[PDB]
Symmetry: D2
Subunit: 257 residues, 4 copies
């Protein structure tokens, strides 16, 4: 197996929800840069394997980690798999880069939202990222990186996605408070807000929604996942060392009013 070197050679990274979509693109980019990437998934193990194998065929290093998030024991399951894999491959449990990308999306009348729907959105999109950050701190060296994938919908009124917006609003608070907490350790903590992005899902196959999504960006297109990944990879690098506690707009001009 040939080894491609890059700016993140020697670093380790966890990307949650890396089996497809934006997460996949993030893992691929971090892997290309030289980071040993833990490609996390809930149930898409074949997709996750494809990503990890892609990273390795291109000269990188990667492995998959299964953990359903939003249920009791989730963070323990995640970190058992992560730390086993990191120890096997590096001799240590150190985690340099954490990308909280896994999330769920939903569209529906606000009048129809149930308490169970609210709990699930909040459990996956806000609660799990908090507890993943909390657990990561015990193994993240000084100079680390935490990047939380939010949404432009925290700045664009979208009644049919209020629950989702609430969960991402909570997510964004992680960067604000933890950036200060972790300043002395030089761990940067930032939110990245993608605009509408073609994740290859069934919902993007629907003509009615797909038509309106393209016009949200000032560029008149939805994003390719790679356009979001390139921003995350920058934040994960030395070049973004003076950026912390920030909201980074990667929406292609969706937040212009």
């Amino acid at each position: 197996h040939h080894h491609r070197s890059g700016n993140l050679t020697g670093k380790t990274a966890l990307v949650t929800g890396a089996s497809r979509g934006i997460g996949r693109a993030i893992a691929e980019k971090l892997g290309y840069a030289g980071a040993l990437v833990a490609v996390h998934y809930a149930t898409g193990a074949d997709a996750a394997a494809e990503v990890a194998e892609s990273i390795e065929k291109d000269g990188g290093r990667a492995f998959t980690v299964k953990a359903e998030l939003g249920v009791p024991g989730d963070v323990d399951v995640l970190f058992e798999g992560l730390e086993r894999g990191l120890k096997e491959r590096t001799g240590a449990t150190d985690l340099d880069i954490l990308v909280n990308n896994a999330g769920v999306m939903a569209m529906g009348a606000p009048e129809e939202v149930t308490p169970e729907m609210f709990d699930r959105m909040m459990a996956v999109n806000a609660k799990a990222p908090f507890f993943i950050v909390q657990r990561a701190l015990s193994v993240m060296p000084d100079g680390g990186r935490i990047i939380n994938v939010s949404s432009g919908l925290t700045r664009v009124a979208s009644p049919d996605q209020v629950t989702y917006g609430m969960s991402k609003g909570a997510l964004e608070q992680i960067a604000l408070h933890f950036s200060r907490h972790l300043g002395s350790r030089r761990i940067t903590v930032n939110s990245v807000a993608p605009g509408s992005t073609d994740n290859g899902s069934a919902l993007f196959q629907i003509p009615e929604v797909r038509e309106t999504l393209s016009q949200l960006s000032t560029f008149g297109e939805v994003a390719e996942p790679a356009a979001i990944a390139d921003v995350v990879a920058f934040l994960a690098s030395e070049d973004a060392r003076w950026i912390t506690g920030a909201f980074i707009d990667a929406s292609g001009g969706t937040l212009l009013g």
Copy 2:
């Protein structure tokens, strides 16, 4: 019983957590303005009665409603009591003004936050306000008002209150998304962000915290609850008809950097 008239005469209002602190001040001000005020509480029934009686002795109309928020059946319990009281006193269940003020606060190391602590903060401060709004829409006439009491801590990094900050970040999203949803009904939906406010609690009796809280405002004082209530009462009035989807900074210059 003598009747004092004001700008809100004929209107009805629910103020959650109106037994003490900011909520009490809000109820008193809305009552003085002529609104029939439902003074809500969880367990401080004697304090709630004192508030309602204060409102009535000053020429207004008020009654108390018990509901523990953040538990199954909470919104049903709340609205059973509210609607019974409104029907008894007005012949209708119409609710003109909704103030989501009830909330919990906590200070502690981020490393020590437990999942149970997170759930409770989110259940009371974000989830319950969402479901209260959802339920209120079925009884709120066009021209109504929804005011959510947030916190300046959504804009000031405060590691020992990250969980609280997350919950208020979620809360703030309610005004953004619902303002658009409800535009055609002319129901305004806004967030108000108090700065540190003397609520008469035990925590304000502690010298160490009380000293640092006073210096957060550019005025070098903590707020009196009445200073926050006067802002809420404005938002509840006709004079604030062109304000919706807004974050209203009632922090006495706490958010200046």
Copy 3:
């Protein structure tokens, strides 16, 4: 009313939003200085309307954006306040006067830029500066901005720049003046019918109405009611703020 015994200057009060603000502050009991550049008869009408409804008011001419402007304004203001009250004290300052323009960004000239900045940002700064010498503790400074500082509008970029500058006044002066308990805030109206012919053209009115989540352009009274609140003791704990009075124009 709640401003009885207070004095106020409302710049650009001869018409539009400023006229509505003057009328509202006067009704609440403030002695209002009704400022104008060339609209002397319209200014006189506003002052008379305030008097007619039981208040006190007078007019003060000053063309803003030219050398000597703030001197002219404050000579007229302070003389008029001293004559009427026995003091030059100014409790409430509303920087409302402003100019608006639409055009392709490629056609903006340096002269157009200077004029916009001179009236919309520079004059408000020097008016605030001069007002500090005569504003008692518990005073109020309210700057009328625009929602266009938050909504990308290429045909109004120079106006946007000027209002972005104006908004910084509240940020920095709120901290400077905290110990005097003078609040300093920006109010951002949405599209508001100022009585100009522009707003009577159906196609233009329709387009502008759709900017608000309410599907209407504002009446000036809707903005004035917000300003009067900020000028009152009810807004004593609001300083350094951006107050969105746009009818939901800033929702994305």
Copy 4:
């Protein structure tokens, strides 16, 4: 590097942050126009440093904030680009040049105000305007603002106003230029050691260091690395943004 074949103008590149930006863009492969007002020898040093490390660069003199400034700048720039590349195409524009000042708000003069606005807001607007005629699709406009647009700083209110105006350029022009895929963004450095004597005074350096959550003032390279990212294809989906490169100065 990732900017090979691209051309760039960095205003105020003779020293400080602009010098670091020029050096970084040149290392990435851009032909860099190193602009200055009076620092000709320092500008020459920067251009030589770029050449020495394998790149291409040249200097262009223009005093900004005076009549004819943009004409002088673009005559020099376009002639130099045409000579070196055969075209006047400008891919990357960095409005970095700016003036800073501290003093009591009561002592600010109209002349001080005009100078600050002329250099920090007006010249960037007219530079952008002129650049549109020679910027190809896929270009980049990056305006260097300041964290002080978000941190109340009474002794720097006029600077704050000027930077608040500057920030509006990205908002409005991002929408104007979307169909050309030219991104327009503001970068906000925190306190950054620009090599001036101010930063060698221990007491001042200590105070400024505490503004960042890292307890240090920035090296110019930390800011330049952010600008170089924005100038690259990696930032193609960032437009109309405020990018906080302040080391956690804006946390409250």
